[PDB]
RNA sequence: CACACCGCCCGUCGCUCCUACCGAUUGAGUGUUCCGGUGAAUUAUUCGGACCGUUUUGUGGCCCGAAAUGGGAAGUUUUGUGAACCUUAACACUUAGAGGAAGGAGAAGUCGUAACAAGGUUUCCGUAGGUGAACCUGCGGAAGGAUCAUU
RNA sequence: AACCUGGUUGAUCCUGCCAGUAGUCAUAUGCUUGUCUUAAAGAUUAAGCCAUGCAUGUCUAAGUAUAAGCUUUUAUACGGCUAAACUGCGAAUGGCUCAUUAAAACAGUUAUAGUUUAUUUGAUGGUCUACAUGGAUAACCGUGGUAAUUCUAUGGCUAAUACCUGCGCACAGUGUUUAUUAGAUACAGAACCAAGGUGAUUCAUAGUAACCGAACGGAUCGCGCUGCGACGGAUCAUUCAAGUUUCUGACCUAUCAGCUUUCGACGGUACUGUAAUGGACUACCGUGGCAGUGACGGGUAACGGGGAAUUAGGGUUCGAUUCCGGAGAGGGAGCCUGAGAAACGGCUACCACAUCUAAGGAAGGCAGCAGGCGCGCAAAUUACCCAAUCCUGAUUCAGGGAGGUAGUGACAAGAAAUAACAACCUGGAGUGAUUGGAUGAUAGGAAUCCAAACCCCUUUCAGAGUAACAAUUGGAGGGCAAGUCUGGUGCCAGCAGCCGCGGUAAUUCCAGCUCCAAUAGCGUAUAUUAAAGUUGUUGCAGUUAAAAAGCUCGUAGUUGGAUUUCUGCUGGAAGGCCAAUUCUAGCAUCCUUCUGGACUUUUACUUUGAGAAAAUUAGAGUGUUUCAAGCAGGCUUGUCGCCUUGAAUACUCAGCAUGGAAUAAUAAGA
């Protein structure tokens, strides 16, 4: 199968390595599955333990925290946004790690109306003492949240969890990424 | 396969045919009794284990505590064994010993020695036959090398006709035939 | 390759068993609270140091019975790995055996008092916390007590119970502490300790000292504190682990055999 | 040179045998890995859904309408792993060859006489030209010379 | 035993090789062969090819019994005992071989904070019809197909520790996935308001906010309000491991000097993939990496090491082969199951061989144990058994060509028969078949040994007088010990390792006689070691014998001048011997931060110490009858036997640590 060793391929001075042994099982490798968006699928494969590692085939869903407010909700995916590695990855919505993606962003809309009450576009004490506690919002961020979407990097590695996850992106990071977004276009 | 360690007792000289060596060494067959020139050149190397043993250890320092041990182990063998007597228990004599120390030492001569075999063939021939009891058991070898609190104690056999006995075969045959 | 060696060889065996080298081409080989090459499987006790047993068969005979025990435990497995202090106890007879190192760099079962077979020391290998945030020892035996003293620390022994569960008696690893040596060249040698080298990488080492004022060496895994300075909690072997030397060991010996 | 100058001994040429060399045949056969081509089996994946059952009603007083939805066969899509075979080339190793031209061996032949004495033109070196053959001569060296030496 | 003799000449002294000599626990081979102990043996070339049989199976009170089986005890669910079959576990160990393979493997030495781990050992844990959930499958019965096999279809029943579901406090557990807070530490405090653990971490662990079902929280079994243990399974250690991984190390070759790369070459960022780390792999980006200290390539009649042979020291050659790694199962490649395999006494495919076929098809892998063909100079029985040694299993009980015992066996190692003694010519103790009377080779018992035979060791009835129970193998010019002997042959036949014998008197041929050397062994051939100071570090030689570049420059390489706290007196601890020799404190202006380590430029060097498997090797102890060996034994009318029994110890460049004043590098120049 696919060879992870390095009895294949160079030495460092340019010469051919001798081989004189067969592939081994604990040099394995397998196929890459460039997981992407859809209705959910999900693959056990087993590995060496006995221990089972699950592939991710098509993701609809995740888990993404908010940072500085502290909630992680669970989310719809609209479609995958900016790659660093390869723009092909971009160009068939392929879910991989550090990849940049769209979300929902009415699941925080109505939780950040019910726990603070300012919104966007008995209790009402609690409201206030979580207000004090923690409510003002990038500016950046109150532009992101009128469309109806925002923009988050995936921090799982769906291949291995079988699990979309990630955190929303906020500060230094969101600026950034708001370059090279504008700078293709 | 099978875990026994084995080694060679003897080796030939390198100079074939010289008549100084050939002379010394059928002395000491026709003194001692001997079959062939392999059993002087036997105790020709089993003096130079030892001999080599004290040569290495002579060498070092008469404080030296591998010295003071290997010494007196070695020491103990040569007055156990009769080739050193008690006298001189210097590592250095251990040096001017010689094959005939060894070879007057052997089973051929102590019974010759103690005269009951009169004559060296004889007394070959009285060990191999199943006589002569050395201590509680008879011997039949003889290159046997007494350690000299044993050697009063060789004696004929209890068995056999010297020792008391059953005579022999060829003497029934007589007295039954008469 | 491929997996675990079931057979062990003769001769590939450890040297402290003392198998010898004819009279079979395999030998028993022990997994089991203790090492391979730091332990001593049931059936060399049974045959070729008690000389219960004549034969391998013979010791099946005995074990199955269900009346060898080690650690108030009954062990039916014939090559189980019974290592360095841990005690053995059969019914029959009413004697019991707590396997110590030898000063020449053997296993030898130590007879003991009925009173005495109750406890034994285990010093313990590191301390960690376990889930719910409860701290727990492990030892060199592999056994793990749990809810110590804050006092116990790496390196050091423990009095275990074994009638019960639980520690009784702790120790300290410090200067002027009396320490077994249990494995390298120094094996079965106990002296008080003088002072440890730290070495802030890898490798801390200990200078001792016998009580005929001889000092040497060891890696802090193979010392193994007993007691305090002077005295001792357990019962010693002959000799009490001085190891007198080579030119005494040859006098001492054929001074015996003469009788 | 010592069989002692009727000494020793050099080279061509002639005859017989043995060993290697060059050699046209775009030589010959075996083995190796290089790009390229075709490409078995198969992990994973794509759709696929022989007929197995969970509820849901239908309907004959547990059979057959069918609709939802777990299991999962054959076949199939695209990938990767990739044996095997073939074309070309190079490298490696054996091997034939008309003719050419070496060396040594015979055991005695033919033609000289080169060297060893100032060997009858002292010997020898490097280089060049010439001649049946040893060899000869030109130019510059060396004594290992036949002179350690004379206003 | 640290060794030397013959051969260039008419003769001498040299250089110098050739020949001789000895060893091999190295093969082959010739002739000879009485005994007992131990015992290598199809490696060398063909990792060429294989008929037949065998080498992996396994059951406890304790997973499942309606045999239409057995067995005497007679049980309204089930008396026990059990074929068969399902389930579980093993089959990845062991055994065999050496074709690959040259910083690869392996060796010693690290690391795993970069990870998986059946089993063993010890821990932990109520939080989600609960007097019990579901429907199929063998064996079995009925019944066929095919020429044929460890091929199997259709039909009818029935099980589970097989398979699959699945309530539960005494919103709400543990685990997974992401985000994220704490995880303190050189010093004391004052005023104001709204405490695990490492040398070291993002470690252990707790907390917060959610995520998924794809995993645990026992629908199991035996003996006996209540004990014991069998099995299952999760996380965390533990153990048996394994995978990577740091540093250093190898034979010949330069008639191999420049290799590597767009298709990963060296590095960077971010994925992916893995049990995890990585150009391991993919996108973009940079232009690197190795080499004259030998890269890259070629050769090996090359698996590596522990080791073996070799009689000063230093070395040279060998290591297929008892142990530890490695690789392979005709050639390559692929893969399932499982804790673990890229498995071959498992499967799929191609290639190369080859078996049966009724011609449609089916099955095969002896570099396992015997055995055969073939290659060769070159190598054993198609034997008996699990009794010892260990291993696997549901296991006190079953199985094992692993392993052991016997047969073949002058590969080899050890011991030692083939005579000894008398009386009756040479006389300065030896001969003289002249008679003479005094232990096993052998053949058969006995007991012992043995799993069953057999051998050894004991004791037995027979058992040598040319002791016919008969010792041979190479030599007799020199080297080389031993005949100017006697016949035959006549540069013939032949000898002859080298020098040389033979042409009609041969100290060498072919014989006889006698003598020499080794001896149950001895000669020959090939390779190898010493001799070889003829490869020379120790340790050669270079005017004329073999050999100083025609001559200067010159980079690495090698080697480099002198010089920087020396002397003196007073102690202290030891110390050998009828005060010397070690080591150490002070005082001549000599640190300190503390209560052993920090500083003294840095190493090499030397010393002591750690850690490093045994076997082998040296070696302590010990009458295996001696001995090669082996690791045993030795005392003793005593019986919980004793010697609180022995089986010591050394040995194993680079790496880690340490005392030290020289020597030599190296650094520098408040």
Same mark, same amino acid.
């Given at each position: 199968?696919?060879?992870?060793?390095?009895?294949?391929?160079?030495?460092?001075?340019?010469? +051919?390595?001798?081989?004189?042994?067969?592939?081994?099982?604990?040099?394995?490798?397998?196929?890459?599955?460039?997981?992407?968006? /859809?209705?959910?699928?999900?693959?056990?494969?087993?590995?060496?333990?006995?221990?089972?590692?699950?592939?991710?085939?098509?993701? !609809?869903?995740?888990?993404?925290?908010?940072?500085? %407010? *502290?909630?992680?909700?669970?989310?719809?995916?609209?479609?995958?946004?900016?790659?660093?590695?390869?723009?092909?990855?971009? &160009?068939?919505?392929?879910?991989?790690?550090?990849?940049?993606?769209?979300? !929902?962003?009415?699941?925080?809309?109505?939780?950040?109306?019910?726990?603070?009450?300012?919104?966007?576009?008995?209790?009402?004490?609690?409201?206030?003492?979580?207000? %004090?506690?923690?409510?003002?919002?990038?500016?950046?961020?109150?532009? %992101?949240?009128?469309?109806?979407?925002?923009?988050?990097?995936?921090?799982?590695?769906?291949?291995?969890?079988?699990?979309?996850? /990630?955190?929303?992106?906020?500060?230094?990071?969101? #600026?950034?990424?708001?370059?090279?977004?504008?700078?293709?276009? | 396969?099978?875990?026994?360690?084995?080694?060679?007792?003897?080796?030939?000289?390198?100079?074939?045919?010289?008549?100084?060596?050939?002379?010394?060494?059928?002395?000491?067959?026709?003194?001692?009794?001997?079959?062939?020139?392999?059993?002087? =050149?036997?105790?020709?190397?089993?003096?130079?284990?030892?001999?080599?043993?004290? +040569?290495?250890?002579?060498?070092?320092?008469?404080?030296?505590?591998?010295?003071?041990?290997?010494?007196?182990?070695?020491?103990?063998?040569?007055?156990?064994?009769?080739?050193?007597?008690?006298?001189?228990?210097?590592?250095?004599? @251990?040096?001017?010993?010689?094959?005939?120390?060894?070879?007057?030492?052997?089973? %051929?001569? *102590?019974?010759?020695?103690?005269?009951?075999?009169?004559?060296?063939?004889?007394? &070959?021939?009285?060990?191999?036959? &199943?006589?002569?009891?050395?201590?509680?058991?008879?011997?039949?070898?003889?290159?046997?090398?007494?350690?000299?609190?044993?050697?009063?104690? @060789?004696?004929?056999?209890?068995?056999?006709?010297?020792?008391?006995?059953?005579?022999?075969?060829?003497?029934?045959?007589?007295?039954?035939?008469? | 390759?491929? /997996?675990?060696?079931?057979?062990?060889?003769?001769?590939?065996?450890?040297?402290? =068993?003392?198998?010898?080298?004819?009279?079979?081409?395999?030998?028993?080989?022990?997994?089991?609270?203790?090492?391979?090459?730091?332990?001593?499987?049931?059936?060399?006790?049974?045959?070729? +140091?008690?000389?219960?047993?004549?034969?391998?068969?013979?010791?099946?005979?005995?074990? #199955?019975?269900?009346?060898?025990? @080690?650690?108030?435990?009954?062990?039916?497995?014939?090559?189980?790995?019974?290592?360095?202090?841990?005690?053995?106890? $059969?019914?029959?007879?009413?004697?019991?055996?707590?396997?110590?190192?030898?000063?020449?760099?053997?296993?030898?079962?130590?007879?003991?008092?009925?009173?005495?077979?109750?406890?034994?020391?285990?010093?313990?290998?590191?301390?960690?916390?376990?889930?719910? /945030?409860?701290?727990?020892?492990?030892?060199?035996?592999? +056994?793990? #007590?749990?809810?110590?003293?804050?006092?116990?620390?790496?390196?050091?022994?423990?009095?275990?119970?074994?009638?019960?569960?639980? $520690?009784?008696?702790?120790?300290?690893?410090?200067?002027?502490?009396?320490?077994?040596?249990?494995?390298?060249?120094? @094996?079965?040698?106990?002296?008080?300790?003088?002072?440890?080298?730290?070495?802030?990488?890898?490798?801390?080492?200990?200078?001792?000292? !016998?009580?005929?004022?001889?000092?040497?060496?060891?890696?802090?895994?193979?010392?193994?504190?007993?007691?305090?300075?002077?005295?001792?909690?357990?019962?010693?072997?002959?000799?009490?682990?001085?190891?007198?030397?080579?030119?005494?060991?040859?006098?001492?010996?054929?001074?015996?055999?003469?009788?």
């Amino acid at each position: 199968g696919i060879s992870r060793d390095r009895r294949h391929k160079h030495r460092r001075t340019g010469g +051919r390595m001798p081989v004189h042994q067969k592939k081994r099982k604990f040099e394995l490798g397998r196929p890459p599955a460039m997981t992407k968006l /859809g209705p959910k699928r999900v693959r056990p494969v087993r590995c060496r333990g006995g221990n089972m590692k699950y592939r991710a085939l098509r993701l !609809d869903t995740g888990n993404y925290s908010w940072s500085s %407010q *502290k909630i992680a909700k669970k989310t719809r995916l609209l479609g995958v946004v900016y790659n660093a590695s390869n723009n092909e990855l971009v &160009r068939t919505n392929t879910l991989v790690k550090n990849s940049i993606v769209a979300i !929902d962003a009415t699941p925080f809309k109505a939780w950040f109306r019910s726990f603070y009450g300012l919104d966007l576009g008995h209790t009402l004490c609690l409201q206030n003492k979580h207000r %004090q506690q923690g409510p003002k919002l990038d500016p950046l961020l109150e532009e %992101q949240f009128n469309t109806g979407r925002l923009l988050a990097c995936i921090s799982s590695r769906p291949g291995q969890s079988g699990r979309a996850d /990630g955190y929303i992106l906020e500060g230094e990071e969101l #600026m950034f990424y708001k370059r090279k977004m504008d700078k293709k276009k | 396969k099978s875990y026994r360690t084995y080694s060679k007792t003897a080796r030939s000289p390198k100079r074939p045919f010289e008549k100084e060596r050939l002379d010394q060494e059928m002395k000491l067959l026709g003194e001692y009794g001997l079959k062939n020139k392999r059993e002087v =050149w036997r105790v020709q190397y089993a003096l130079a284990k030892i001999r080599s043993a004290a +040569r290495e250890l002579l060498t070092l320092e008469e404080k030296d505590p591998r010295r003071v041990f290997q010494g007196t182990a070695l020491l103990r063998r040569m007055v156990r064994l009769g080739l050193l007597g008690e006298s001189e228990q210097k590592l250095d004599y @251990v040096l001017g010993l010689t094959v005939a120390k060894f070879l007057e030492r052997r089973l %051929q001569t *102590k019974v010759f020695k103690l005269g009951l075999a009169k004559s060296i063939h004889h007394a &070959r021939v009285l060990i191999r036959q &199943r006589h002569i009891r050395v201590g509680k058991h008879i011997v039949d070898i003889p290159s046997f090398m007494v350690r000299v609190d044993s050697e009063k104690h @060789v004696d004929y056999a209890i068995t056999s006709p010297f020792g008391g006995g059953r005579p022999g075969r060829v003497k029934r045959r007589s007295l039954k035939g008469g | 390759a491929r /997996g675990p060696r079931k057979h062990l060889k003769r001769i590939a065996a450890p040297h402290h =068993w003392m198998l010898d080298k004819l009279t079979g081409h395999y030998a028993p080989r022990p997994p089991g609270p203790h090492k391979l090459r730091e332990s001593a499987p049931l059936v060399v006790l049974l045959r070729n +140091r008690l000389r219960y047993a004549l034969t391998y068969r013979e010791v099946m005979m005995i074990v #199955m019975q269900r009346l060898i025990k @080690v650690d108030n435990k009954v062990r039916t497995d014939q090559c189980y790995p019974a290592g360095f202090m841990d005690v053995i106890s $059969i019914e029959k007879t009413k004697e019991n055996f707590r396997m110590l190192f030898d000063t020449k760099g053997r296993f030898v079962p130590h007879p003991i008092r009925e009173e005495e077979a109750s406890y034994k020391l285990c010093r313990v290998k590191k301390v960690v916390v376990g889930p719910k /945030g409860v701290p727990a020892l492990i030892t060199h035996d592999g +056994r793990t #007590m749990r809810y110590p003293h804050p006092s116990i620390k790496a390196h050091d022994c423990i009095r275990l119970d074994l009638n019960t569960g639980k $520690i009784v008696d702790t120790l300290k690893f410090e200067a002027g502490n009396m320490a077994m040596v249990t494995g390298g060249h120094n @094996v079965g040698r106990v002296g008080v300790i003088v002072h440890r080298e730290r070495h802030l990488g890898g490798f801390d080492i200990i200078h001792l000292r !016998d009580a005929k004022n001889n000092e040497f060496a060891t890696r802090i895994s193979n010392v193994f504190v007993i007691g305090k300075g002077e005295k001792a909690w357990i019962s010693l072997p002959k000799e009490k682990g001085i190891r007198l030397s080579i030119m005494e060991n040859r006098q001492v010996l054929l001074k015996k055999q003469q009788m």
